Structure 1
Amino acid sequence: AHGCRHVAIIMDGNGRWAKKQGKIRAFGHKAGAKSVRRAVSFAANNGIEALTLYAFSSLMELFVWALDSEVKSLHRHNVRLRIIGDTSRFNSRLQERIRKSEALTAGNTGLTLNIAANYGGRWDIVQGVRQLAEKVQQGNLQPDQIDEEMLNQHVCMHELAPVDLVIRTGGEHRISNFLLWQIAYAELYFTDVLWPDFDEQDFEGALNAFANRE
Structure 2
Amino acid sequence: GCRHVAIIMDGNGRWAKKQGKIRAFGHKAGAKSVRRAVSFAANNGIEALTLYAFALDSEVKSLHRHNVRLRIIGDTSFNSRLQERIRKSEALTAGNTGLTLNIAANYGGRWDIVQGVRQLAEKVQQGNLQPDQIDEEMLNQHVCMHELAPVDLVIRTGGEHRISNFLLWQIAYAELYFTDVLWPDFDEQDFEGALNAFAN
Which whole-Å CA distance do the structure 2 matches of 1:73 and 1:92 have between them? 24
Equivalent-residue separation in structure 2 for 1:68 and 1:134 (angstroms): 35
Q: Which secondary structure state, in structure 2, belongs to the residue aligned with residue 137 of structure 1? A: coil
Greater per-residue helix proportion: 1
After TM superposition, the score normalised by the length of structure 2 is 0.99
What SS does the aligned partner of 2:75 have? coil
- Residue 164 of structure 1, CA deviation: 0.1
1:69 aligns with 2:67: no
Aligned to 1:53: 51
TM-score, reference length from structure 1 = 0.92
Q: 2:22 and 2:104 mapped to 1: Cα distance?
A: 24
Q: How far apart, in 1, do the equivalents of 2:71 and 2:51 lie?
A: 11
Q: Secondary structure at the match of 1:115?
A: strand
Cα distance, 1:66 vs. partner?
A: 1.3
Once superposed, what is the RMSD of the aligned Cα atoms? 1.3
Q: Give the whole-Å Cα distance in 2 for the aligned partners of 1:66 and 1:99.
A: 14
1:52-94 per-residue CA deviation (whole Å, 9 max, x = no partner) reads: 0000xxxxxxxxx911111111000000000000000x11111
Instruction: State, as a whole percentage, how many aligned pairs show the same letter.
Output: 100
Q: Deviations over 1:113-158 (max 9, x none)?
A: 0000000000000000000001001111111100011101100000
What are the ranges of 5 or more consecutive residues in structure 2 without an aligned counterpart?
Answer: none
The aligned residue for residue 76 of structure 2 is 87
What whole-Å deviation, never above 9, does each CA across 1:88-110 have from its counterpart, x for those lacking one?
Answer: 0x111110001111111111000
Stretches of structure 1 lacking an aligned partner (at least 5 in a row): 56-64
Distance in 2 of aligned mates of 1:114 and 1:83: 5
1:162-194 CA-partner distances (Å, limit 9, x unpaired): 000000000000000000000011000000000
Counterpart CA distance in 2 for 1:91 and 1:35 is 29
Secondary structure in structure 1 of the residue aligned to 2:61: helix
**CA distance in 1 between partners of 2:130 and 2:192 (Å):** 46
Counterpart-to-counterpart distance in 1, 2:131 and 2:97: 38
Q: Distance in 2 between matches of 1:69 and 1:134?
A: 38
Moved beyond 2 Å, runs of 4+? none
> Aligned pairs, how many?
200
